[PDB]
Amino acid sequence: MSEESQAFQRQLTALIGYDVTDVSNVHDDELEFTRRGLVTPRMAEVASRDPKLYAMHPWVTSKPLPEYLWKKIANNCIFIVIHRSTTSQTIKVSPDDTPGAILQSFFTKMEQDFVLRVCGRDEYLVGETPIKNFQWVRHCLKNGEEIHVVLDTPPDPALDEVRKEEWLWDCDRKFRVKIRGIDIPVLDLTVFVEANIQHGQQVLCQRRTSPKPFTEEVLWNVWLEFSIKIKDLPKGALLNLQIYCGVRLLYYVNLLLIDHRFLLRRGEYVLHMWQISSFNADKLTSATNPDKENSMSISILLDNHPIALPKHQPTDRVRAEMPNQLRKQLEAIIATDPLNPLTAEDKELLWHFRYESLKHPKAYPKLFSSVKWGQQEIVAKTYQLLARREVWDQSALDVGLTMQLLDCNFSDENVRAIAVQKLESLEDDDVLHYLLQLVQAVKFEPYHDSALARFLLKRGLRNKRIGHFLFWFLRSEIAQSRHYQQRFAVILEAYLRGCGTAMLHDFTQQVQVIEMLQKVTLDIKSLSAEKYDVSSQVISQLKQKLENLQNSQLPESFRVPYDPGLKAGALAIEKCKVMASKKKPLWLEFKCADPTALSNETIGIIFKHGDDLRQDMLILQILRIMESIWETESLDLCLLPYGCISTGDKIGMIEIVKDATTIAKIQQSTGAFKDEVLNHWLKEKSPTEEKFQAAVERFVYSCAGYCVATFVLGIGDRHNDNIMITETGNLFHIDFGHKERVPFVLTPDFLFVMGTSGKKTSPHFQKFQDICVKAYLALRHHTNLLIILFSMMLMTGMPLTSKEDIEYIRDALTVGKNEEDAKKYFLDQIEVCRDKGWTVQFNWFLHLVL
Ligand SMILES: O=C(Nc1ccncc1)Nc1ccc(-c2nc(N3CCOCC3)c3cnn(C4CCN(C(=O)c5cccnc5)CC4)c3n2)cc1
Description:
With 850 residues, this protein is an alpha+beta fold. It folds into 5 domains: 1-165, Phosphatidylinositol 3-kinase Catalytic Subunit, Chain A, domain 1 (Ubiquitin-like (UB roll)), CATH 3.10.20; 170-305, Immunoglobulin-like, CATH 2.60.40; 306-500, Phosphatidylinositol 3-kinase, accessory domain (PIK) (Serine Threonine Protein Phosphatase 5, Tetratricopeptide repeat, Alpha Horseshoe), CATH 1.25.40; 501-658, 2-Layer Sandwich (Phosphatidylinositol 3-kinase Catalytic Subunit, Chain A, domain 4), CATH 3.30.1010.10; 659-842, Phosphatidylinositol 3-kinase Catalytic Subunit, Chain A, Domain 5. Its EC number is 2.7.1.137, 2.7.1.153, 2.7.1.154, 2.7.11.1.
């Protein structure tokens, strides 16, 4: 009974990597209160989700086929191949044809319960969408391939079954907190404590303490009194205790003043605080350190029969005209970039004229940053403002903006909630583009249960794909983030309890696999020095240990975390080789458990341990965004954002791109380089000089995409050790752990392929200057969306600290200039790489000296 639940919770705890029943690290029931809250939205979505479509999770889009995918048209005819057993029959189809409409034309060209499954994958060509609007199809086209499909039985919705779940204002006293003392084990200095009252990163009030000698224990007993009445404390307000050294910041911890029940905080607390190895998302956490045996502590008293916060209640339609030169200043402000700080006057002006600012949704981020949140009366005037959301509600979703209201500068439930309301109108296609961000954006939420959380949860349970990646993006944080694992765990359990028995069995297999393969790598790296190269007594112990796990542990087949349609199966021991890198990665390879697989190409995975893979993920998920932004302007820069998921602490997986070789291995075929080796290698891997020319094309595109991209994200200056290229001309970076500086890697060996030397030009290189600016300006259009993604990436991924760090992308997009001053700028930079050729490429080699 409650024994088939303690084996289930035993199941769920394993899948998660955190025991959501553990209270060994909390001073209230917010995490639990939240486990309980989320039951409804789960159950609503499980309740409402359609069984057939959920099982087939058709991956479609409601976008317009780009100009370029039309030029592969073939006179309004797309050919689709079907296979029942050994059979197969091409079939002309219209792009606007549906799936149903196509079994109709097929049954009569050659008992209604057959769905077109894709050959080799668990991807389904079903439902009421033009087949031109399926992503699997738009893919085969982009890549010039052959839409293979096998007619067979619709998968059973009974497998997606789910187990039924068993389960005032007006106190004028200035607010005080008594700092009793600090206590730490192994600590000769001087040290005080700083008590900030925070709200979305701004300090409402701050009162420090008397410095004192740095011993293992330090008392004070002070009553600390702040300037701020207890009526003006805003819901979400943080009491933030920090501890400085003499000067430098060394410890922090945080406590919500208003709890989840709206009650204020009364009482005695002993808070375990986080140590520091400037803005960072771990500085905002309400979580306390769980390593109570080593971490600094702190004790404090909240005197405060209990005082509680009232949920505002809706209640001035008078209108006056606005001078010209004021509305000039308003509209000027509202136009500026997110990263533009507001002067106190810009603020008084924005707030003063708040009803005219409400008309431009683009002024919402700047305006809700103009609120004295330390002022009970202001704050309400604000609630009454968000009640007049006629224009917001009607506004076309703008994601740059929505995001902005979910970053660290906004900590007010009502604001954030309107951003989320806008997220609702996103088709699942777009949710996947931004899911990682909108999972990271949960770090800036003040309370565990939030509307953002309930949105990730709805959307994830409604579509299986999103589901899958929601699992791994969450499991990735829970495992390497002590500041947020407890919050994310409550959420992931929430999702798991509604995804179906079908996917539990699947995540159970992916995790076990990853669980073993973690093991092998560790064992294997502990035999080779960060110095040592690759031993053959090692190559014997690898194929020893895989031969082993293959001959027992690894299940017949598991789904591929970075690409879940694909089922991998049996190991290709022969191909599996530890790689040369100092951090000793595992080049792996599997056959595809799917009998209907067209090719024999294997599934190629690179288990790495030694570094945090979450920084690769963020960078990639942005490039995938840049592409979709090059699709809305009919542009395709052939990027290769390889799959790369993080699975646990400092270890994850990467996708191996078939038949691709670095630049460096191309050159070393005493650090010199030669130009012709580019082409020589291309022509050698182009059977015909026809395919050779297709290849030189990718190279112009790909090379150009990756130079714009890399320039923007400030990661252009790489070493050819870290650039690669497929046999078919496609160029792309790897390893994102990122004297004379180069804006990006455009070394003379590329130019050569473009057919140029020293200071010349050619039919390709003029093209390449052509495409680049098309691609650059295209981004400049979406400046705001990119700044806010960049900013949020630093704060939730690159321990980022500096506000000047972001003032970068500002300049790199060169804001507030016309499409000319820019196109120059860029093409100026294209040139700087010419005036430098290899000098820097050479230095990444000579570096091994300094
Ligand atoms: O680290 C990180 N993240 C990180 C996060 C946080 N903080 C630090 C680092 N992420 C990462 C690192 C490396 C790779 C990668 N992905 C490959 N793919 C095979 C083809 O589909 C694409 C992937 C290959 C193929 N080869 N490699 C290298 C092996 C080691 N290398 C050499 O031994 C070497 C040296 C000199 C000249 N040639 C080779 C250099 C070449 C690859 N590395 C991928 C991801």
